Structure formats: structure tokens, C-alpha cells
Amino acid sequence: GPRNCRELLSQGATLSGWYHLCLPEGRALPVFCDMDTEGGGWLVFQRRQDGSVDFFRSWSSYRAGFGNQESEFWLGNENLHQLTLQGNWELRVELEDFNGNRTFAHYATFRLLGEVDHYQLALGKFSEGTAGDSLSLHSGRPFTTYDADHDSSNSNCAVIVHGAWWYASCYRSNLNGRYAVSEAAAHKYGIDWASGRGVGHPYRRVRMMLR
């Protein structure tokens, strides 16, 4: 089958939805392709919109992916590593506050290193975005989870901020953070983007996507 969402689109798959990709190692993977936004051809690998899915999960869970196709999910670190082995994939982050105001952030490339290197983030340069840049700090850093502490803190940031991310100590972004249904409900550390609304001021809806 197809290697990515751009190729599905070219062959006339014009509706956003769940499609199979054939990974380089010859394995099939269900992914959500956004065929509509910004030209289309985006592979959505993370999505937050209602708090129905628990994102405070272990190393194996984040490695393999988890969640619901109808709602919230993380595609999986190993899938992201395999997809990003070859090709150049731009990252688009989409964020929406409780007022429906949408902001964005675009990076030239996105790649994850392998499990041996703790799925370390290799991020390209920030090109444009109304949300601003809150991911560059995390470039070069290992992913850490509650049961796999690899950060640069003398504590475990996954536990501290209740998430999983390429933590330093701890973050400028935490998009896999704990869901809050409004503001009054907001956590001390939530689904935050520092240079957008700042730490402790979360978003209602989030997507991360590659093309």
C-alpha cells in the first residue's frame, strides 16, 4: 500500500479519515489522514479534544500507541520512529482554546530516533506560527514516561507534570498533559504551550500532524 497520506490523496483519497499505510518494514498501520486542512495529506499522530482518553501512560503504551480512533489517541513512538526513518516530514501543531480561537506552529522536519535512544526528538527549525515556538527546547531530548525517567531533572517530570514528553525539567510544551474541561478546571501543569497561553493555561483541543 501507500507510504503516507500525500500519496493516498494523489490517488484520489480526498476524505479525511482512517487509512492503512504500509510501513517500510512491510507492516500495515491504521492512521488518520487529514485530506482537507492546508492542502491536505497530513498524518495526524496525536489528538486531544474531550478528555475521554487517559494520557498518563507507561513506556510500552507510548511506544505502541493507545486511544480511540473516534476521539483521542497517540499513534505510538515506534510507529513515528519507523515512519520518520526516511523522507522529510513537516510538523504542524494545532491548538484551540475554550473560545474556539485556533493557533498553530510549524516546524520544517520531525523525526524520532529509535527505542535504544529513547525515541529522542529531532526537530527542524520553526518556520511560522501564531502559537509561537514551544518545542525547540525539547529537540535533542529523550522521551520520558512515569516508568522511564530520562529527563534532566533530579526528579521524574512525567510524574511531576502528569504526562509524557521529551521533558527537560520540565517543559515549554506538554501536549500529552492532563485534560481539563475548562479553565476553572485547569491543572497546575496541563495541555500547555508556553509561548501561546503559557504554562498552567491549557487548550480544549490539540492535534499534532505530519506531511
Add this chain to the structure above:
Amino acid sequence: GPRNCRELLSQGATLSGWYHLCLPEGRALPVFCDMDTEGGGWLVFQRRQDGSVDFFRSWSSYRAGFGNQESEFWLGNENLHQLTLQGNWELRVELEDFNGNRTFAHYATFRLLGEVDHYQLALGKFSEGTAGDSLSLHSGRPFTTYDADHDSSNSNCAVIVHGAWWYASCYRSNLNGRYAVSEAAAHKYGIDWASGRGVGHPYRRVRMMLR
């Protein structure tokens, strides 16, 4: 190798959802099959429900289709043309107002001619429906978008009414029109069925279905 939704149902696909058809041309086509309404086997080729998708699109977009399997879409004029080359597909239109009342219109056949003929509508007679007949006028007319005006107006109906359709000068129905959440938000030209709620009094939800 299934060619439509009734075929799928015959083979035991009894739950409404997204399936793949195979076009006579050798292309796989995700479609929504309604497997219950009036015996089931309906291919839904247009849906509106929340205003999340922009429907003011070019000739090319409408030709190839656009939208979101999870929400609102147009399956695409070339797809509809290829589906309807042979066989005779009945058309059912479903309409839901802001109160939640549902009305309907049924036509004996629905077929689109090729792109060479501007995806001209060929429509059978209205048979019955509580919505009334607001499509007959459009039978025998070419499709029109903002960048390809084939209508019977001195101006471009698609631009005037902000939609795409088999426009005359301009319409009795406009189901690809601009979304409105209420009818306080209603545009002068919206998602309209003239014999139902009238021009300028839109519907919250719409589907167009063949079989």
C-alpha cells in the same frame, strides 16, 4: 470488489458506516453506507451537520470530492459520475431543521453526466416527500462553482449564493451552501430547500443518499 452499498449489505455488512467500494475503473473508494434506512443499502454522498467543513470550493475540489469522514463531505462529481453511469439509483434527500424535525424528498433516478458535460444533472421524477420537490428545476443543468460558471445567470450563482450546485438563476435548492448554526445566524442564501422551509431558512443537518 463491492460496487455499492446494497451489494455490501447482501454480503452481510449490516452496520452503517464507512466501507470501500471498487470503482469499475479499478479504484477503491471509501463511502458511507446507511445500512438501515428504509431497508438499508444507501450510499450517502453528501452530509452537512456542524459547519466544520468549507463547502465554497473550486471545480477541482468538487470534481475530486472533499471533507471529513467523521463529519461533513462531498464525495466528488467524478465519483458520482462513475457510480451512476449504469444502473438506476434512487435519490433520497434528508433534511433536519433546528428544532430536530426531519423531512425528506425522493426522486426516481439520479445520474451525473461526465466532466465534458459539466457533470450535468439527470434527475427522475419526484415521487414523494414531506420536504416537497426543490430539485426538479435543477434537472438537466450543468454543475457550477466559483471558478466555473455554467449557469443561466448573467452573474455567477456560486459566488452570489456562496455554494456549488446545478444552478439556474439561481436555485430552488442549495445544500452545498454556507452553514448556519441557527437561524439567528442564517445567511440570505444558505443550506436551503425552497419547497420546505424556503430560501433563507436553512437546515441544521442534511444528507443526500443514493441506491
Add this chain to the structure above:
Amino acid sequence: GPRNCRELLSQGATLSGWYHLCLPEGRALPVFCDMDTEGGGWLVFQRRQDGSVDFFRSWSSYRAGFGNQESEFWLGNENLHQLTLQGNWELRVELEDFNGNRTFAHYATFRLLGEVDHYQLALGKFSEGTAGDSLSLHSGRPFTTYDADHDSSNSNCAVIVHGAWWYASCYRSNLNGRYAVSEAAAHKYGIDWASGRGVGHPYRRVRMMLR
């Protein structure tokens, strides 16, 4: 094709949703796999919520399955019989009252006999469950619908209680029973589990699943 949901999970299908299984007879079957609950790998064959789907159906409807991938459904007695002829399927029932209290029941095995045997329930022992046992009484009984009365009563239990089930002199469980949006607007007989909330006190959400 894969034989069950745990085999899919095993192969990297970690997001809950609709996958195809391939039955002994080679017939591909769309099913919902829950890839999370109790470690994931559950095939959900029944789901109630909202009440958008009519569950008062014929023998042949229950045989074939009906409903909506998006919402409520019954997968099909014939499907279940086919799945369940090669063995070891634990049953898990999930119940949710009108505020959001979830209850459960587990049975070691679940199997449906063929049509000639009226899709008779063959149920293993009740292992544990906060909802208590309400299905042990229906084990060994034939399925019945309004147009096929096989029950242990001088009356027609499917019509009397407005559902379809392996009724005895009717039920200790009535999960395919009529939907109540609230109590307030409950039913003498509804989506009930006697050892739980009890007859006349329905649930809002329900799933029946196999692993």
C-alpha cells in the same frame, strides 16, 4: 485475515475502533475492537447508548446484525455463532447507570449454537462482577424475537418486554430492551440487569464483549 481482536492488538493495532476479522468461511467481518479495557483485545458485539437504534427486531435481523458503527448495534447471531465455534471466548458485560456508575459481569466462556438450535446460549460460569449474575439463568435457552417465540412461557416474552434475548419466563437480563433516555422516563421492562439496578431501573450505556 486475523481471527480475533487480541491477534490484531498483537500485530500493532493499538487504537480501539473498527477492524475486519476473517471468519472460517472466509467472509470478512467488520467488528469493534476495544484495545484498552483490561489490557485490550475485546470484540464488542453489542452496544447501547443514546437510543438512536431500534432494537425490537425480527429473527432474521438479529441473525444478520443491525445498527450503526458510530453508535448502537447488535453484531449478529450468525456472526457470533461462527466466531464462537472455535473456542475460548470470555464474556464481559459493562453497565452504566444515569450518573455514570459503571458495573461489570464476567463469565468464563460464551458460545452460540447454530440456527437450527435457535442460537441457543452456551454460557460458562460467572467468575466475578460488581453487577452480579443475571445471565446464568439464560444459559442453555434458545434466543427469541417477536416473530419467533422459543421461550419457556405461555406468553411471548420478546413482545411482552419489547426486546429479544434468550428469554426463559422472560428475564433476569434484558439488555436488548427498549431504550430510556432517563428514569424518570423508564419502562416497566427495559435495559435491565436484575442483580444490579434491577428490573424497572435501566442503564444509560451497555456493552457486551468477548475475548
